[PDB]
């Protein structure tokens, strides 16, 4: 009672240390989550539009391939904002142009039939090439 006052006083100071600790381990775990998650959602959104993309490689095959001269000028913002909308994402085409020309990607690239589709460190569909 008398110094049991001091006893609980102790108890509580003790739960001070004990408590703050209980916290800082928390701060640890919390702040720690981020590295992981950030990178998890990284890998989430590099791929997974791959279907959209190699599905869309036929319609930008005729919008990269196929009086009305004004009607042909109009295709300006169409294949302008459709190799442009492949951009902020990052699925490019294949650019070598008369080089070694990696065969999975004398002996120089003469021409290219199918326009490239590639999104972020992978290969979608190849070009039939000269």
């Amino acid at each position: 009672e008398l110094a049991a006052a001091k006893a609980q006083i102790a108890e509580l100071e003790a739960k001070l240390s004990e408590m703050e600790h209980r916290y800082l381990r928390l701060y640890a775990d919390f702040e720690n989550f981020r590295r992981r998650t950030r990178q998890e959602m990284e890998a989430a959104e590099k791929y997974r539009a791959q279907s959209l993309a190699s599905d869309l490689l036929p319609v930008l095959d005729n919008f990269e391939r196929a009086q009305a001269k004004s009607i042909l000028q109009g295709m300006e913002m169409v294949y302008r904002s459709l190799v442009d909308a492949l951009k902020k994402e990052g699925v490019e085409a294949i650019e070598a142009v008369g080089k070694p020309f990696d065969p999975y990607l004398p002996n120089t690239v003469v021409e290219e039939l199918q326009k490239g589709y590639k999104l972020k460190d992978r290969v979608l569909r190849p070009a039939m090439v000269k």
Binding site: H21, L24, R25, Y27, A28, D29, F30, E31, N32, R35, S70, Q73, G74, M75, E76, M77, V78, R80, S81, D84
Partner: protein, 502 residues
């Protein structure tokens, strides 16, 4: 308990935000919108609010548009089935904001706080706490927009000082000059413009644009609203580009088609006129307070359209120095509302130190091949645990050797601990389990345990320094792993799984 949730209403600029942990947070709406805005409607038996209310607005009797003008006024709208007041309409603004902060968090916010104007007084700034509680969400205080983002950032570490804000509304401008009371905020001066802003900017784009197209083909623009929508959007684009980027163009084509190379200094000489419709409000403040442009301790950039270098090239040569850009200005009121929201009902004084780990820590596999458990950068008050098994059949005992660094090699790394453990039961390799909890406290002396399972015989170590040394010495090594760039040739010992004999 409950966390005290921010809601600002800026009349076409509005947000409800929060704080989770040690990082300030800007909520998402039901619409895909990072922020859904302030205006609404009604119909038979069913309310419609937000970006979903607002395009049923040019299509239906009910749209309220920027009611900021009627807060603290005797203004009463005549509307179907009952006339209405600013309060009951705003009760629904924040009823919807309530369901939305709820359908985000799941941990409800009853207690909440608001962002008002610094100019306001006993009439309207009461109207805030009042209509704040009309929807049902109580107000633990009402901040003012300017003292708000001031404390989103926050001034109270620092000393007795002076400042001027930048509010950019949605087509409104403002700035409010403030001072420090060494822990106290009292907003000193006020100025700005009733209509000026981002949409106006878009319309100087749309205007010189349309005028230039009548300059070429003779054929006029503004009669056409999908065309003009096309305009608003693409011109907004070119805008924020001119801000960041050094060169531009706009692909607007298949018009009916304009393809232009969008310029910056033409858009600037386009926009460098209303930047002195600002300098007016600004210096009018400089006189409302009395202290010259040279009297201030810090100053700031707020609002949605404030992201362009126009005003900032008007300032660097106006007040002598650069602004604090350390925010994402667009939502910058919302979070501010809750900063103290959690300084009151919640956490107190914060070190948040030794939040990082010197190096990736791991130990001695397969004669020195180094596997990580702890990585680098990791908040220190933590411990990770892993269990290996037998090198070879009948290991009578196991020694433990731990490394710090990255390079996956034995003396290509820093020898940390070496201590051994004996009595293991004799039996086939791989089977018996030995645990090591790397137990890392906050303070820097690291404990590490290894103990059999079936034994429950355990040896652990309490290290000492872990570092004992300086920054450059470490980072010279953090560099060193990179510098080596494939000493990974030790996949040679990876094929030393030859060890398997069968």
């Amino acid at each position: 308990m409950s966390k005290i949730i921010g809601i600002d209403l800026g009349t076409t600029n509005s947000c409800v935000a929060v704080l989770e942990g040690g990082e300030v947070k800007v909520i998402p709406n039901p619409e895909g919108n990072r922020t859904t805005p302030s205006v609404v409607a009604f119909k038979n038996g069913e309310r419609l609010v937000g970006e979903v209310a607002k395009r049923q607005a040019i299509t239906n009797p009910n749209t309220i548009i920027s009611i900021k003008r009627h807060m603290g006024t005797d203004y009463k709208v005549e509307i179907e089935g009952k006339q209405y007041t600013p309060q009951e309409i705003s009760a629904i603004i924040l009823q919807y904001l309530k369901s939305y902060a709820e359908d985000y968090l799941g941990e409800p916010v009853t207690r909440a706080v608001i962002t008002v104007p610094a100019y306001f007084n006993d009439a309207q700034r009461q109207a805030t706490k009042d209509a704040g509680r009309i929807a049902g969400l109580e107000v633990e205080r009402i901040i003012n927009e300017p003292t708000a983002a001031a404390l989103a950032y926050g001034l109270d570490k620092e000393e007795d000082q002076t400042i001027l804000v930048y509010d950019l509304g949605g087509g409104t401008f403002d700035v409010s000059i403030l001072e420090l009371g060494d822990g106290v905020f009292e907003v000193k001066a006020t100025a700005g413009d009733n209509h000026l802003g981002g949409d106006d900017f878009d319309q100087v784009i749309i205007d010189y644009l349309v005028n230039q197209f009548k300059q070429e083909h003779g054929i006029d623009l503004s009669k056409d609203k999908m065309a003009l929508q096309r305009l608003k959007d693409a011109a907004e684009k070119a805008k924020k580009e001119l801000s960041g980027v050094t060169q531009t163009q706009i692909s607007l084509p298949f018009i009916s088609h304009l393809e232009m190379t969008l310029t910056r200094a033409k858009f600037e000489e386009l926009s460098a006129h209303l930047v002195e419709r600002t300098m007016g409000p600004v210096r009018q403040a400089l006189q409302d307070a009395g202290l010259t442009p040279a009297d201030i301790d810090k100053v700031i950039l707020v609002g949605g359209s404030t992201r362009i270098p126009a005003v900032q090239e008007a300032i660097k040569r106006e007040l002598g120095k650069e602004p604090h850009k350390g925010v994402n200005p667009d939502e910058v009121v919302a979070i501010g509302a809750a900063i103290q929201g959690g300084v009151i009902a919640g956490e107190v004084k914060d070190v948040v130190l030794l939040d990082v780990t010197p190096l990736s820590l791991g130990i001695e596999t397969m004669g020195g091949v180094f596997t990580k458990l702890i990585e680098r950068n990791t908040t220190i008050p933590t411990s990770k645990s892993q269990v290996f098994t037998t090198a070879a059949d009948n290991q009578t005992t196991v020694d433990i050797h731990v490394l710090q660094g990255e390079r996956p090699m034995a003396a290509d790394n820093k020898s940390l601990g070496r201590f051994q453990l004996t009595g293991i039961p004799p039996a086939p390799r791989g089977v018996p389990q030995i645990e090591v909890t790397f137990d890392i406290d906050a303070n820097g002396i690291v404990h590490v345990r290894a103990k059999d399972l079936g034994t429950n015989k355990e040896q652990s170590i309490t290290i000492k320094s872990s570092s004992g040394l300086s920054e450059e010495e470490i980072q010279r090594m953090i560099k060193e792993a990179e510098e080596n760039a494939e000493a990974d040739r030790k996949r040679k010992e990876a094929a030393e799984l030859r060890n398997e004999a069968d």
